[PDB]
Structures are given as C-alpha cells and as structure tokens.
C-alpha cells in the first residue's frame, strides 16, 4: 500500500512510520508527506529519509473545502492508497473525509473517548488517572478505534515524563496499526465497524 502522511509542524510520529516501512515484511512504502506549513521540521525529516513532500498553503484557496480538494489532488497524482495524519492541525472537510473513509488514520495521546481535544497529557495528571494511553483510529467526522495500548502514570510525572512515555507507545502503535490496515488485515466493514479480516494469500 502506497501511504500519504500529512503534516502541520514536526510530523510527530512520522520517524517510526519510515522506520516501520523499511522492515522486511513492511506491507506500506510511504511516498509523499504533505504540509500546510512550510519549512516545518516534518518537512526536513521525510527530505532526510528521501520521501517526496509537497506545501499545500491553505492561505491560497477561498475555503475549507477548496483547500482539502488541493490535498486530495496531490493524494491523487501520487496514486495514494492510505493517509496518516501526523499532527496535522486543520479540520478536514466533510468530502474530504467522506471519501477517505477506513483509508485515514489518526493518533491520539489518550486511550479515547477519554480526554479528548488538546493537551490530553495535562488532562490526564490534573484527573489524577493511574492509566492512561494512546489510541490509533479511522478519521471520521471520532472515528472507529484500531489499536490502543495501556500506559502507567507513575507517580510524580511532569507533563513532560508523561508525554514522552506516551509517545514510546505512539512510535510502537501507529507503525502497528498502519501495517495492520495496509496489510488488508484490519478493514472498516459496509457496517461501519472495524473488521479483522483472513486473507486468502497465504
């Protein structure tokens, strides 16, 4: 499967994704990452790895809509098969996320639905949890859960302790559910909800 990562700044993630794909038995090859931002520092990591990148300024077109077309026709041009979201920072269009529907995925530094929105770090330590944890799952308007995986907050955490052992289970399960989804072993069924699905090629 041919893979698009779009990003906002420094394509958090992004690193463990090419890693991932550079493996043996890798069923995704990322081909082009996308920012609305130029210069950032995810530009200059996939332009180190030697991935192709393009700068879509949302400045440039009349609305939302017009600006995610612009997306979607780079998508198009390099034959994309499955987007993977990397701190991208606008709101994507109801098309434009209509058509990508069980092709998109997104991670999120909670086990959701639990603090949603930013900061989920601070949120965490200010409720006082002992777990907490990261999620990987379809884009929708959200969006149907692919993996998740528990993380201890241990005693005396900073914002900072917390967020990079979130971030050690981010790099192990966005590369994870990328290869489940690019594999076709993980689908989003007619019904909306994910599928584990036995593949005939053996």
């Not at 893979?3 to 994704?17: F, Y």
């Not at 994309?80 to 997104?106: E, H, T, Y």
């Not at 005396?156 to 690019?182: M, N, Y």
């Amino acid at each position: 499967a041919r893979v698009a990562v779009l990003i906002s700044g420094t394509g958090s993630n992004l690193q463990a994704l090419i890693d991932s794909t550079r493996e043996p038995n890798s069923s995704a090859q990322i081909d082009i990452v996308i920012s609305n931002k130029a210069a950032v520092a995810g530009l200059d990591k996939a332009e180190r790895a030697g991935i192709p990148t393009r700068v879509i300024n949302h400045k440039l077109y009349k609305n939302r809509v017009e600006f995610d077309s612009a997306i979607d026709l780079v998508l198009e041009e390099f034959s994309i098969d499955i987007v993977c979201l990397a701190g991208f920072m606008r709101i994507l269009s109801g098309p434009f996320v209509q058509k990508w529907n069980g092709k998109m995925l997104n991670i999120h530094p909670s086990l959701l639905p639990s603090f949603k929105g930013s900061n989920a770090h601070e949120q965490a330590l200010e409720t006082g949890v002992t777990v907490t944890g990261c999620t990987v799952h379809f884009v929708a308007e959200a969006g149907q859960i692919i993996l998740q995986e528990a993380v201890p907050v241990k005693r005396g955490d900073t914002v900072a302790t917390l967020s990079e052992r979130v971030k050690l289970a981010e790099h192990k399960i966005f590369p994870a559910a990328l290869q489940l989804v690019a594999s076709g072993t993980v689908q989003l069924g007619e019904n909306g909800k994910i599928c584990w699905v036995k593949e005939e090629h053996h």
